[PDB]
């Protein structure tokens, strides 16, 4: 139970690791670009904004 | 015509940040910040594919931003070391114009608005092509000639 | 206008290669290479369905490459032996211009950019038409009129 609960806890940590990597690899062009705006659909998917 | 819209970074010859649209933006491969009091406080994004650092313009500077466009017709454009030709889909200047530490500089449309930022250059014959970033159809991308040097 | 972007190969009647866009490009039915020091070093792709040999440019020459386009309206175009007419989809010349050893020579748009390379000539009385290669719809093709002889 100790080794299982530790590896499973590390694996839900690695799954949350998509916010640390996948979110940035999708979203950073929309943070870098001058005056542009992200499409509304993607804004909800990445939890990034109330609007723009 | 005016060319004053940069701010420098570090007490060294190491390039500049541009005040463009809604954001300050800067080359990421260079360091030492505080040649302006806003670089001292701004929280910066960065990304390794494109070599930008970006931050939203502060409440006191909002009015002073340079205008910009994604448009790039063929022909002639301006930058701080003079005329620059965009042809064959690439920017070019005479070799010996531009150098290491002349980086983060804008390229201007003759209608007085930014279309790219300079990051470096190549030496594949003495009429140097530029490494640059630009916002084609409202997304940033990087252009990089083969064997080009980061400035 | 200038033909000066051509580079010859061998101390023979055999031909030349063209510095165009991103590449050196050459006719495949002819041989001998080393009149020029970049033809000595480069590794060439080839295809007997188009009769090209090509290599991507060495990192000191790209500034000297001739500009290119796919655009080919009806009318008059330029090469080393003067005026050349593109009509009915053929390139065509005054009879007795061109000879064996004058394959591998570029055809220029009047705006000073390449649109085809010569391979050889067909003749019917006072009518003369060229086998050539060109990049319509962004990808290489070969044109070859009846009974054409390679140069």
Automatic annotation (TrEMBL), chain A:
Specify the protein name.
Structural polyprotein
Q: Where are the transmembrane segments?
A: 1-20
Function, as annotated, reads: Provides the signal sequence for the translocation of the precursor of protein E3/E2 to the host endoplasmic reticulum. Furin-cleaved E3 remains associated with spike glycoprotein E1 and mediates pH protection of the latter during the transport via the secretory pathway. After virion release from the host cell, the assembly protein E3 is gradually released in the extracellular space.
Task: From the Swiss-Prot or TrEMBL record, state where the protein is found.
Answer: Host Golgi apparatus, Host trans-Golgi network; Host cell membrane; Host cytoplasm; Host endoplasmic reticulum
Q: Describe the subunit structure.
A: Homodimer. Homomultimer. Interacts with host karyopherin KPNA4; this interaction allows the nuclear import of the viral capsid protein. Interacts with spike glycoprotein E2. Interacts with host IRAK1; the interaction leads to inhibition of IRAK1-dependent signaling.
Q: Source organism's superkingdom? A: Viruses
Please state which portion of the whole protein this structure contains, as first and last residue out of the total length.
696 to 747 of 1248
């Amino acid at each position: 139970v100790s080794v299982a609960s530790f590896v499973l806890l590390s694996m839900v940590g690695v799954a949350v690791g998509m916010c640390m990597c996948a979110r940035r690899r999708c979203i950073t062009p929309y943070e870098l670009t001058p005056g542009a705006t992200v499409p509304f659909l993607l804004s909800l998917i990445c939890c990034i904004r109330t609007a723009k | 015509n005016d060319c004053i819209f940069e701010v420098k970074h570090e007490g060294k010859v190491t390039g500049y940040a541009c005040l463009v649209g809604d954001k300050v933006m800067k080359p990421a491969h260079v360091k030492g910040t505080i040649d302006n009091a806003d670089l001292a406080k701004l929280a910066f994004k960065r990304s390794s594919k494109y070599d930008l650092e970006c931050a939203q313009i502060p409440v006191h500077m909002k009015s002073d931003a340079s205008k910009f466009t994604h448009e790039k017709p063929e022909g002639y454009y301006n930058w701080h070391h003079g005329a620059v030709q965009y042809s064959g889909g690439r920017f070019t200047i005479p070799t010996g114009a531009g150098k290491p530490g002349d980086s983060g500089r804008p390229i201007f449309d003759n209608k007085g608005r930014v279309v790219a930022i300079v990051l470096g250059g190549a030496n594949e014959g003495a009429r140097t092509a530029l490494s640059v970033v630009t916002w084609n159809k409202d997304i940033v991308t990087k252009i990089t000639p083969e064997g080009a040097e980061e400035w």
